[PDB]
Amino acid sequence: GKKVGMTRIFTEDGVSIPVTVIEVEANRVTQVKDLANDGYRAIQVTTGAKKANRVTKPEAGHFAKAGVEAGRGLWEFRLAEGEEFTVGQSISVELFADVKKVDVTTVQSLDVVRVDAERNLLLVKGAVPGATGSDLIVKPAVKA
Amino acid sequence: NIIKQLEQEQMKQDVPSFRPGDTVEVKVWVVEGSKKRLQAFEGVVIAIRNRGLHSAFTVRKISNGEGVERVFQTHSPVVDSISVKRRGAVRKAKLYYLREIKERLN
Amino acid sequence: MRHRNSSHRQAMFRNMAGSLVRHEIIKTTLPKAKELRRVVEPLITLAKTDSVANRRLAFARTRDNEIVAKLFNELGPRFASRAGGYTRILKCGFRAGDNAPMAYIELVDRSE
RNA sequence: CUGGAGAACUGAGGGGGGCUGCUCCUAGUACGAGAGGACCGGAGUGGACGCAUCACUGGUGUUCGGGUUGUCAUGCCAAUGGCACUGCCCGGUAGCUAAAUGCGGAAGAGAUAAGGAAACUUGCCCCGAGAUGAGUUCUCCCUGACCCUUUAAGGGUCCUGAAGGAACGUUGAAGACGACGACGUUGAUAGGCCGGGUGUGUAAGCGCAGCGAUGCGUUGAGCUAACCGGUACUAAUGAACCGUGAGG
RNA sequence: GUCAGGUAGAGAAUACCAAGGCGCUUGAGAGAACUCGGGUGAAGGAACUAGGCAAAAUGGUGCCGUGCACGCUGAUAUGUAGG
């Protein structure tokens, strides 16, 4: 996701929680790594959009192979042998609904305040590294 | 625009209009174990910070012996109502010099 | 960490800005020309609309009656339809004295 | 199992780390002849050190704005500007700093010693192929001619300049050794012109009364830099250089 | 050693000007890895050190307290005691 400023939310009881507000477009998978080829399980995902004239076709061909629209940058995360993903699958922010602690890259064990899909938005209690408009990686807290 | 859209619904439009140097009464919720009480605070506004959802104002109260300053968050749920008693006729944005007033009749 | 003294810097731009208006073109170092823009166009924008207060404020800057007369009379109307970008910078090699990058800075006019 | 580029991963090894104390439930329990009264595990509340670090809480801010003393210039009064440490004092919207706020140490697994512990080896966080089994996985570009000829990774001539990258120019909050984030005309990164918000808190000019020093109407208005929301009628344009043409 | 104007001020200090004398014999852009020197910056104002040293604070006089007045006075008086 992309960091978009910071604000606070007031609760009904009265306390105010300072929240880092992160915008997370739909993340669309581009490549799936497996034991047979890469020796490990991971999925490569992209986000955003890039100008056609500026995206070099070595990546465009790589994107076109998966039917994926050219995004900005590429990231991939290792799997936990408990989930499966297919090339071209679109991943939205609702996956964070069931998890209360998240890791933002690293500042770890941050409470999640609110998640919505209609506006592709995620909320984190605290501060995260980087200025506004920077790229952030949000994953569930490992220290359970 | 993402930030602004997020705070518009959180802000409250029932904010009364007051100016620095005005005598203000503000009601604040109080929690004592399991009860909600309304506490009334009397004082004079000596500073207002306008930032939208983060807008706040400082009120100085001359207590029994010494003054007490209190910074209220305008849009916080803790504050319930704000009422103006006197229309102070000052010509300064921040009245910090009262640490060490006329009436506007307008 | 950035993420002449102030008085000298302010006076120099005030003088150079007046000379630019008077002559419509001047030869100066490229960094000076770039920084001069942030002082020059704001004058022309103010001159687009004429008022007693604007005339006085325009005088408070450049402290010259000739320039104010030059403004509000033809620089105003000549740039009324133009939304910014009243200045043009042309690089003209380097100064022989100290190899400084020099450039002509000239208002978009003189199309006779 | 050595052709020439732009990305995403596997992580051996190495470096920074194994905070402390108290209360409550477990419990008028274990041990002991009574009183006194657990330890561990779990949860919660402070302080110290380090990373991240600004929506909200303070301070600072030599450019903008309000007020003012002595003197001077702009042929004048009023209205300004420059100098006297930023003339002196009182504040603030962006960037930089913490007192405040927020996160991390704990738990689990194989191997302990003494007689199955906070130390070692891990898990968590940051960095990592000048770590030679020699570029894994994915993707983009390339099938061009004659002589000499001791006939073989030999030399010379002619034709060609892809993918990708660098320079110059508009930006540089990565903290000046700079090949780095993006954008460079199907083009809003910066320097302007507008609108909105904040700060400053009643300007210039005009009018009534007092015919003075103030205040009111005009007017919650005028002004406002690095920022927010729009607009290319200005300028980053169009030719080179560098890197090749089927891989022992 | 002498001659050294106007305003402000007790003065021969200091600041601001006229006349006169000058820009001092390398410059244009970019910002600080804090080598140096000032103003300002929360305060349990001594948590530093042998010594609160050097800074800062401070200084005055439309004065009755062993706290008050201070930049301007429609008017008293369109200049009051008086040389």
XYZ file of C-alpha atoms (C1' of nucleotides) in Angstrom:
693
model
C 0.000 0.000 0.000
C 0.820 3.699 -0.103
C 1.003 5.938 2.954
C -1.381 8.908 2.718
C -0.864 11.251 5.643
C -1.929 10.662 9.218
C -4.900 11.583 11.384
C -6.811 10.518 14.499
C -10.179 8.956 15.316
C -12.383 9.691 18.324
C -14.181 6.765 19.935
C -17.611 6.878 21.557
C -16.195 6.547 25.075
C -14.043 9.627 24.480
C -10.457 8.458 23.980
C -8.767 9.501 20.726
C -6.472 7.101 18.869
C -3.789 8.488 16.504
C -4.072 6.457 13.315
C -1.850 6.027 10.285
C -4.088 5.883 7.229
C -2.805 3.690 4.395
C -4.416 3.480 0.956
C -4.172 -0.020 -0.527
C -5.344 -0.508 -4.098
C -6.357 -3.977 -5.218
C -3.151 -6.012 -5.339
C -3.040 -8.272 -8.396
C -0.762 -11.313 -8.570
C 1.751 -11.608 -11.417
C 3.841 -14.720 -10.720
C 3.615 -17.809 -8.521
C 6.795 -19.526 -7.345
C 6.932 -23.208 -6.419
C 9.395 -25.881 -5.341
C 9.762 -27.326 -8.839
C 11.187 -24.140 -10.383
C 12.276 -21.693 -7.675
C 12.752 -24.052 -4.724
C 10.346 -22.119 -2.488
C 6.697 -21.071 -2.350
C 5.917 -17.397 -2.942
C 3.643 -15.132 -4.975
C 4.786 -12.014 -6.829
C 2.292 -9.156 -6.717
C 2.054 -5.676 -8.203
C 0.032 -2.532 -7.607
C -0.723 0.839 -9.118
C -0.267 1.820 -12.740
C 2.622 2.999 -14.899
C 2.777 5.020 -18.096
C 2.930 2.834 -21.192
C 5.663 4.990 -22.726
C 7.709 4.738 -19.516
C 7.302 1.026 -18.736
C 10.023 -0.856 -20.586
C 8.632 -3.799 -22.518
C 10.866 -6.395 -20.781
C 8.470 -5.867 -17.882
C 5.449 -5.360 -20.151
C 6.030 -8.767 -21.703
C 6.407 -10.156 -18.191
C 3.138 -8.474 -17.211
C 1.385 -9.502 -20.429
C 2.316 -13.145 -19.822
C 0.111 -13.176 -16.713
C -2.632 -11.023 -18.234
C -1.672 -8.404 -15.650
C -1.870 -4.671 -16.229
C 1.484 -2.931 -15.852
C 1.855 -1.636 -12.298
C 4.624 0.102 -10.385
C 7.248 -2.067 -8.720
C 7.027 -5.743 -7.790
C 6.938 -7.451 -4.399
C 6.507 -11.066 -3.317
C 5.778 -12.776 -0.007
C 6.452 -16.318 1.147
C 3.548 -18.702 1.720
C 2.739 -20.715 4.844
C 1.715 -23.969 3.083
C -1.865 -23.269 4.192
C -3.067 -21.172 1.261
C -3.004 -21.228 -2.533
C -3.014 -18.495 -5.161
C -3.342 -18.356 -8.937
C -1.689 -16.038 -11.435
C -3.734 -12.919 -12.101
C -5.726 -13.170 -8.874
C -6.738 -9.830 -7.367
C -6.188 -9.318 -3.633
C -8.005 -6.583 -1.721
C -7.776 -5.278 1.838
C -10.560 -7.364 3.405
C -7.961 -10.028 4.240
C -6.946 -7.880 7.227
C -10.423 -7.957 8.793
C -9.756 -11.105 10.836
C -6.299 -9.985 12.064
C -5.804 -7.380 14.791
C -2.000 -6.952 14.718
C -0.091 -6.085 11.542
C 3.538 -5.481 10.604
C 4.362 -2.420 8.494
C 7.613 -2.177 6.537
C 9.864 -2.615 10.065
C 7.486 -1.528 12.824
C 5.688 -4.551 14.233
C 2.621 -5.280 16.366
C 0.428 -2.364 15.284
C -3.298 -2.435 15.983
C -5.644 -2.248 13.003
C -8.496 0.213 13.520
C -10.689 -0.053 10.420
C -10.750 -1.733 7.014
C -13.104 -1.088 4.093
C -13.176 -2.364 0.516
C -15.330 0.230 -1.256
C -12.590 2.839 -0.735
C -9.596 0.451 -0.606
C -8.412 1.857 2.709
C -6.637 0.487 5.785
C -6.050 2.100 9.181
C -3.185 1.421 11.598
C -2.790 2.674 15.171
C 0.554 4.448 15.434
C 3.261 5.662 13.060
C 4.930 3.844 10.172
C 8.284 4.514 8.465
C 8.511 6.835 5.506
C 6.939 10.095 4.400
C 3.629 10.566 2.608
C 3.289 8.793 -0.723
C 5.878 6.139 0.126
C 5.403 2.419 -0.458
C 4.575 0.247 2.552
C 4.243 -3.512 2.982
C 1.616 -4.680 5.476
C 1.685 -8.273 6.707
C 0.096 -9.978 9.722
C 2.096 -9.778 12.930
C 4.450 -12.728 13.346
C 4.822 -12.331 17.127
C 1.525 -13.959 18.053
C -8.212 14.518 -0.400
C -8.145 11.083 1.245
C -7.474 12.703 4.622
C -10.119 15.394 4.138
C -12.778 12.881 3.077
C -11.988 10.824 6.175
C -12.410 13.683 8.669
C -15.507 15.391 7.227
C -17.834 12.770 8.708
C -15.882 12.727 11.979
C -16.165 16.496 12.452
C -19.249 18.055 14.040
C -21.040 21.004 12.447
C -22.620 22.209 15.718
C -19.455 24.096 16.735
C -20.356 27.561 18.087
C -18.463 30.587 16.818
C -16.177 32.142 19.434
C -13.138 34.410 19.366
C -10.021 34.732 21.522
C -10.614 36.667 24.713
C -14.235 35.547 25.032
C -15.642 34.194 28.285
C -16.614 30.591 27.519
C -18.428 27.864 29.438
C -17.683 24.330 28.231
C -19.346 21.104 29.375
C -17.106 18.025 29.493
C -18.056 14.415 30.161
C -16.485 12.766 33.207
C -16.164 9.071 34.071
C -16.130 7.944 37.722
C -16.029 4.153 37.760
C -19.354 3.469 36.059
C -21.109 6.861 35.931
C -21.135 9.693 33.394
C -21.251 13.195 34.875
C -21.310 16.562 33.110
C -18.672 18.961 34.456
C -18.934 22.700 33.801
C -15.715 24.661 33.201
C -15.714 28.475 33.302
C -12.888 30.521 31.857
C -11.648 32.920 29.201
C -10.344 31.771 25.823
C -6.730 32.853 25.342
C -5.747 30.880 22.224
C -7.447 29.080 19.338
C -5.690 26.600 17.045
C -7.598 25.960 13.812
C -6.604 22.839 11.886
C -9.957 21.262 10.988
C -10.492 18.026 12.894
C -7.515 18.944 15.107
C -8.810 22.405 16.012
C -8.388 23.236 19.696
C -8.657 26.214 22.025
C -7.033 27.117 25.339
C -9.094 28.369 28.284
C -7.558 29.963 31.379
C -9.486 29.830 34.655
C -8.542 31.906 37.696
C -9.021 29.344 40.463
C -8.756 29.856 44.237
C -5.167 31.055 44.435
C -3.713 30.403 40.992
C -4.757 30.135 37.380
C -5.417 26.888 35.541
C -5.055 26.486 31.781
C -6.958 23.832 29.855
C -6.622 22.851 26.193
C -9.856 21.472 24.740
C -10.196 19.560 21.487
C -13.121 21.229 19.744
C -14.202 18.110 17.856
C -13.533 15.610 20.646
C -16.612 13.748 21.951
C -15.593 14.696 25.501
C -16.837 18.264 25.016
C -20.633 18.408 24.746
C -21.614 22.087 24.581
C -19.841 25.442 24.427
C -21.530 28.707 25.397
C -20.215 32.272 25.231
C -20.901 34.617 28.150
C -18.986 37.800 27.266
C -17.722 39.140 23.933
C -14.205 40.229 24.866
C -12.956 43.274 22.944
C -9.331 42.281 22.425
C -7.195 42.693 19.301
C -4.747 39.796 19.569
C -4.942 36.267 18.208
C -3.193 34.680 21.215
C -3.697 36.180 24.677
C -0.680 34.654 26.415
C 0.119 37.945 28.168
C -2.628 37.271 30.726
C -0.460 34.618 32.401
C 1.643 37.225 34.209
C -10.879 42.918 29.322
C -13.221 45.250 27.468
C -16.560 44.117 26.019
C -17.357 44.309 22.328
C -21.015 45.411 22.497
C -21.469 44.558 18.803
C 19.468 20.041 5.808
C 17.534 21.496 2.871
C 14.639 19.091 2.365
C 24.698 36.843 0.407
C 22.900 37.751 3.607
C 19.139 38.270 3.645
C 19.338 42.059 3.376
C 21.848 42.031 0.519
C 19.918 39.290 -1.273
C 16.641 41.199 -0.990
C 18.188 44.457 -2.207
C 19.894 42.804 -5.179
C 16.676 41.200 -6.412
C 14.846 44.484 -5.880
C 17.405 46.295 -8.038
C 17.669 43.568 -10.672
C 13.881 43.274 -10.877
C 13.626 46.999 -11.562
C 16.294 46.828 -14.258
C 14.504 43.931 -15.961
C 11.237 45.877 -16.139
C 12.973 49.023 -17.375
C 14.963 47.326 -20.143
C 12.794 44.233 -20.887
C 15.987 42.116 -21.009
C 19.155 41.710 -18.939
C 22.228 39.479 -18.933
C 22.896 37.768 -15.609
C 24.106 34.495 -14.146
C 21.749 31.565 -14.648
C 21.140 30.906 -10.918
C 20.327 34.586 -10.412
C 17.901 34.551 -13.339
C 16.087 31.475 -12.028
C 15.767 32.942 -8.534
C 14.764 36.329 -9.955
C 11.633 34.823 -11.487
C 10.104 34.139 -8.069
C 10.309 37.919 -7.519
C 9.500 39.191 -11.018
C 6.266 37.580 -12.239
C 4.424 38.226 -8.936
C 4.869 41.921 -9.739
C 3.317 41.541 -13.197
C 0.395 39.525 -11.827
C -0.372 42.294 -9.344
C -0.095 44.864 -12.139
C -2.754 42.990 -14.138
C -5.391 44.534 -11.859
C -5.042 48.238 -11.073
C -6.010 49.804 -7.748
C -4.758 52.444 -5.335
C -3.701 49.770 -2.847
C -2.040 47.680 -5.558
C -0.146 50.714 -6.841
C 1.105 51.443 -3.324
C 2.137 47.844 -2.657
C 3.797 47.640 -6.072
C 5.769 50.750 -5.089
C 6.753 49.305 -1.711
C 8.457 46.637 -3.808
C 11.213 47.954 -6.116
C 10.867 51.377 -4.394
C 10.842 53.190 -7.729
C 8.197 55.427 -9.271
C 9.428 54.811 -12.826
C 8.869 51.056 -12.564
C 5.379 51.471 -11.111
C 4.613 53.808 -14.001
C 6.042 51.191 -16.361
C 3.766 48.653 -14.702
C -0.012 49.151 -14.591
C 0.182 50.934 -17.976
C 1.447 48.491 -20.617
C 2.913 45.484 -18.790
C -0.518 45.036 -17.230
C -2.668 44.903 -20.359
C 0.058 43.236 -22.437
C -0.050 40.250 -20.051
C -3.727 40.361 -19.045
C -4.581 37.334 -21.200
C -1.415 35.427 -20.205
C -1.683 33.198 -17.125
C 1.850 33.229 -15.771
C 5.103 32.534 -17.538
C 5.829 36.157 -18.426
C 9.586 35.502 -18.405
C 11.954 33.594 -20.665
C 15.522 32.508 -19.888
C 18.050 31.886 -22.670
C 21.460 30.487 -21.782
C 24.311 32.367 -23.458
C 27.518 30.519 -22.659
C 29.824 31.381 -19.766
C 31.248 34.636 -18.463
C 34.873 35.055 -19.501
C 35.760 36.745 -16.215
C 35.065 33.759 -13.972
C 33.429 31.098 -16.186
C 30.015 31.752 -14.709
C 26.968 30.381 -16.594
C 25.261 33.434 -18.085
C 21.752 33.701 -19.488
C 19.476 36.397 -20.879
C 16.204 36.815 -18.975
C 13.579 38.685 -20.964
C 9.849 39.288 -20.804
C 7.750 37.666 -23.508
C 7.293 40.822 -25.591
C 9.092 42.891 -28.247
C 7.555 41.130 -31.259
C 7.878 44.143 -33.576
C 26.198 -26.054 -17.527
C 30.857 -17.403 -19.564
C 25.890 -13.821 -25.500
C 24.314 -8.398 -24.256
C 19.933 -5.655 -20.145
C 15.755 -4.084 -16.821
C 12.949 -6.783 -11.839
C 10.976 -10.084 -8.181
C 13.053 -14.489 -4.614
C 15.886 -18.807 -2.002
C 19.877 -16.801 2.933
C 24.904 -19.803 4.632
C 27.871 -16.457 7.343
C 28.282 -11.847 10.173
C 26.413 -7.473 13.201
C 22.710 -4.952 16.677
C 19.256 -8.040 20.747
C 17.320 -12.499 25.418
C 14.997 -4.821 30.406
C 13.606 -4.552 35.550
C 10.146 -4.000 39.569
C 5.055 -4.022 41.800
C -0.278 -5.294 42.139
C -4.763 -8.514 40.988
C -7.111 -13.759 39.609
C -5.200 -18.669 40.469
C -5.379 -18.592 46.729
C -6.895 -17.819 53.546
C -3.377 -22.468 48.801
C 2.049 -25.399 49.170
C 5.881 -25.997 53.356
C 5.595 -25.574 58.911
C 3.504 -27.029 65.570
C 0.387 -21.596 64.838
C 0.408 -16.540 63.244
C 2.814 -14.209 59.207
C 2.215 -16.353 54.050
C 3.692 -18.615 48.493
C 6.748 -19.704 43.824
C 5.775 -20.328 38.567
C 2.442 -19.421 34.473
C -1.372 -15.577 32.660
C -3.215 -10.434 32.672
C -2.658 -5.154 33.892
C -0.070 -0.573 35.518
C 5.449 2.901 35.654
C 10.679 4.194 34.582
C 15.329 3.572 31.596
C 17.747 2.296 26.243
C 16.961 1.762 20.748
C 14.021 1.846 15.707
C 9.747 4.081 13.521
C 8.241 8.816 14.681
C 3.549 14.833 13.567
C -3.720 13.668 12.640
C -3.605 15.551 18.085
C -0.204 17.902 22.721
C 4.884 22.183 23.304
C 9.094 25.102 21.697
C 11.768 27.302 17.566
C 11.112 29.596 12.403
C 16.989 36.042 9.784
C 11.241 35.711 3.830
C 4.654 37.111 5.070
C 1.439 39.896 8.576
C 0.215 43.232 13.225
C 2.349 47.157 16.673
C 6.371 50.829 17.780
C 11.065 54.336 19.637
C 15.532 57.892 17.694
C 17.290 59.462 12.820
C 17.482 59.784 7.200
C 16.348 59.211 1.811
C 12.609 58.648 -1.969
C 11.189 67.845 -4.553
C 6.490 67.184 0.238
C 2.336 66.214 5.009
C -0.381 61.519 5.566
C 0.488 56.601 3.932
C 6.052 53.256 3.299
C 10.999 51.179 2.786
C 16.253 50.599 4.531
C 19.812 50.652 9.126
C 20.700 50.304 14.452
C 22.113 41.806 16.754
C 16.325 39.465 13.436
C 15.935 47.600 16.389
C 13.181 45.298 20.932
C 8.950 42.321 22.590
C 4.460 38.943 21.923
C 2.459 34.233 17.977
C 1.553 30.766 13.929
C -0.099 27.294 8.975
C 4.754 23.585 6.101
C 9.936 21.077 6.886
C 13.507 19.739 11.324
C 13.347 18.236 17.395
C 10.447 15.031 22.501
C 8.304 15.590 27.860
C 3.510 13.116 25.122
C 1.755 9.084 21.991
C 2.834 4.224 19.641
C 5.781 -0.435 18.899
C 9.495 -4.088 20.209
C 12.209 -7.886 24.822
C 8.008 -12.423 26.981
C 5.627 -17.544 24.933
C 7.031 -22.463 21.387
C 11.012 -26.354 19.283
C 16.271 -29.792 18.985
C 20.859 -29.946 21.902
C 22.511 -27.828 28.390
C 25.438 -27.786 32.770
C 25.191 -28.447 38.043
C 22.199 -31.670 41.143
C 15.229 -29.858 33.018
C 17.008 -22.060 34.325
C 17.053 -14.936 32.010
C 24.059 -17.254 29.577
C 25.772 -20.343 23.990
C 23.271 -22.290 19.280
C 17.239 -20.260 17.339
C 12.317 -17.834 16.527
C 11.282 -11.685 15.914
C 13.585 -6.773 13.360
C 17.506 -4.425 9.769
C 21.349 -5.654 6.021
C 23.277 -9.467 2.590
C 26.152 -13.059 -4.240
C 33.874 -9.287 -5.177
C 29.041 -17.239 -0.641
C 32.651 -18.498 -7.468
C 28.055 -25.939 -7.776
C 29.690 -19.177 -11.337
C 23.470 -15.883 -12.742
C 18.319 -20.440 -10.626
C 12.505 -18.811 -11.696
C 9.816 -14.923 -15.036
C 10.047 -11.350 -19.090
C 12.056 -8.041 -23.548
C 15.512 -7.410 -28.213
C 18.982 -9.830 -32.504
C 19.212 -15.026 -38.535
C 24.295 -8.489 -42.044
C 28.548 -8.955 -47.156
C 33.669 -9.471 -50.175
C 39.632 -10.449 -50.293
C 44.380 -12.256 -48.086
C 44.653 -17.155 -46.223
C 50.968 -20.851 -42.938
C 43.310 -22.651 -42.960
C 42.753 -21.091 -37.590
C 38.592 -17.892 -30.629
C 44.293 -14.589 -36.488
C 44.395 -9.639 -39.145
C 42.132 -5.795 -42.580
C 37.824 -3.351 -45.294
C 32.384 -2.207 -46.083
C 27.239 -2.064 -43.943
C 24.172 -1.744 -39.309
C 23.236 1.165 -33.810
C 17.890 -2.958 -31.137
C 16.375 -3.996 -25.850
C 18.284 -1.311 -21.869
C 21.208 2.541 -19.531
C 24.037 7.123 -18.981
C 24.873 12.689 -20.065
C 22.301 17.836 -20.590
C 17.495 20.497 -18.489
C 13.016 20.899 -14.877
C 13.233 18.133 -9.306
C 16.707 16.097 -5.026
C 12.786 15.672 3.465
C 18.407 9.492 0.249
C 21.245 14.163 5.164
C 26.491 16.642 -0.104
C 31.893 10.784 -2.794
C 26.008 11.111 -5.914
C 25.843 6.020 -11.143
C 20.113 7.801 -6.422
C 11.980 7.879 -6.391
C 9.020 9.221 -10.572
C 7.635 12.671 -14.411
C 10.956 15.309 -19.456
C 5.085 17.653 -25.051
C -0.855 11.562 -25.396
C 3.767 16.276 -20.925
C 1.267 19.466 -13.537
C 7.984 17.330 -10.439
C 9.490 22.605 -9.690
C 9.300 28.247 -10.546
C 3.693 31.412 -11.507
C -1.587 32.833 -12.248
C -6.766 31.283 -9.083
C -9.983 28.939 -5.211
C -10.259 26.968 -0.035
C -8.120 26.536 5.009
C -4.737 28.472 8.893
C -1.891 32.575 11.039
C -1.747 37.954 11.623
C -6.772 40.620 14.356
C -9.566 46.059 12.205
C -4.771 47.990 6.286
C -4.913 51.914 2.138
C -8.804 55.256 0.795
C -13.768 57.734 1.864
C -17.652 59.568 5.367
C -20.258 61.331 10.571
C -19.333 63.252 15.632
C -15.394 65.425 18.989
C -12.907 69.857 14.963
C -6.997 67.017 19.176
C -4.721 62.073 20.944
C -8.556 57.230 20.109
C -12.698 54.305 18.669
C -17.048 52.924 15.144
C -19.088 52.333 9.619
C -16.556 51.222 5.192
C -14.503 45.458 6.670
C -13.824 39.341 10.471
C -11.555 42.539 6.035
C -6.555 43.442 3.378
C -1.979 40.493 2.879
C 0.201 35.638 3.252
C 6.763 32.195 1.019
C 8.467 26.156 1.087
C 2.699 23.110 1.324
C -3.585 21.350 -0.258
C -7.413 21.294 -4.606
C -7.208 22.920 -10.678
C -5.250 24.878 -15.373
C 0.576 23.914 -20.028
C -1.132 30.520 -24.034
C 6.207 29.952 -20.593
C 10.450 26.848 -20.541
C 12.282 20.556 -19.877
C 11.913 19.985 -27.767
C 13.950 17.630 -32.409
C 19.877 15.428 -34.105
C 24.837 12.681 -30.915
C 28.174 9.859 -27.650
C 28.233 4.806 -24.972
C 26.433 -0.233 -25.492
C 25.615 -4.652 -30.965
C 24.219 -8.187 -34.843
C 23.106 -16.085 -32.860
C 26.759 -17.188 -28.003
C 34.233 -22.005 -26.547
C 48.682 68.727 18.375
C 44.714 72.051 16.514
C 39.890 73.112 13.355
C 35.188 68.472 14.219
C 27.772 71.080 11.513
C 22.037 69.364 12.356
C 18.505 65.991 15.334
C 18.167 62.670 19.663
C 21.153 62.527 24.691
C 23.701 64.866 30.967
C 28.317 64.498 28.070
C 33.566 64.670 24.005
C 29.468 57.677 24.103
C 26.286 55.414 20.211
C 22.835 55.288 16.025
C 20.794 57.932 11.735
C 22.163 62.368 7.558
C 24.338 66.903 4.300
C 29.302 68.474 2.203
C 33.850 65.841 1.396
C 36.305 61.142 1.074
C 34.797 55.524 -0.796
C 33.083 49.776 -2.294
C 39.007 48.141 1.083
C 43.218 44.548 -5.784
C 39.723 36.797 -7.076
C 34.024 35.669 -8.598
C 29.350 33.327 -10.138
C 25.754 28.679 -8.267
C 24.618 24.650 -4.854
C 24.232 23.447 1.657
C 25.746 22.851 5.834
C 29.587 15.718 7.416
C 29.329 21.229 13.224
C 36.428 23.008 12.944
C 34.880 28.682 15.057
C 31.794 32.975 16.757
C 26.193 35.754 18.266
C 20.532 36.372 19.292
C 16.464 33.054 20.702
C 14.661 28.161 22.693
C 10.337 23.756 28.090
C 12.872 24.180 33.826
C 12.497 19.977 40.060
C 17.255 26.714 37.482
C 22.679 23.679 39.727
C 20.971 16.957 37.296
C 27.993 19.671 35.244
C 32.692 21.450 37.601
C 38.015 22.498 42.353
C 35.590 27.552 41.489
C 27.180 29.181 39.250
C 34.190 31.952 35.962
C 33.353 33.729 30.819
C 27.568 34.690 28.906
C 22.748 35.929 30.162
C 19.899 38.781 33.606
C 20.893 43.832 35.009
C 21.183 49.335 33.648
C 16.945 54.172 34.664
C 14.095 58.634 37.342
C 6.674 63.308 35.324
C 10.079 59.088 42.973
C 7.383 58.715 49.677
C 7.821 52.809 49.096
C 13.182 51.931 53.454
C 5.936 50.688 45.547
C 4.187 54.831 41.785
C 4.927 57.867 37.457
C 7.458 57.156 32.013
C 5.627 57.314 24.146
C 0.956 61.593 22.899
C -2.102 66.482 26.558
C -9.488 69.839 22.971
C -7.944 72.333 27.920
C -5.826 74.681 32.425
C -2.503 78.635 29.478
C -4.443 78.872 21.273
C 3.648 78.962 26.276
C 2.913 78.730 33.758
C 7.377 80.558 37.685
C 11.144 84.201 34.575
C 16.416 86.040 31.783
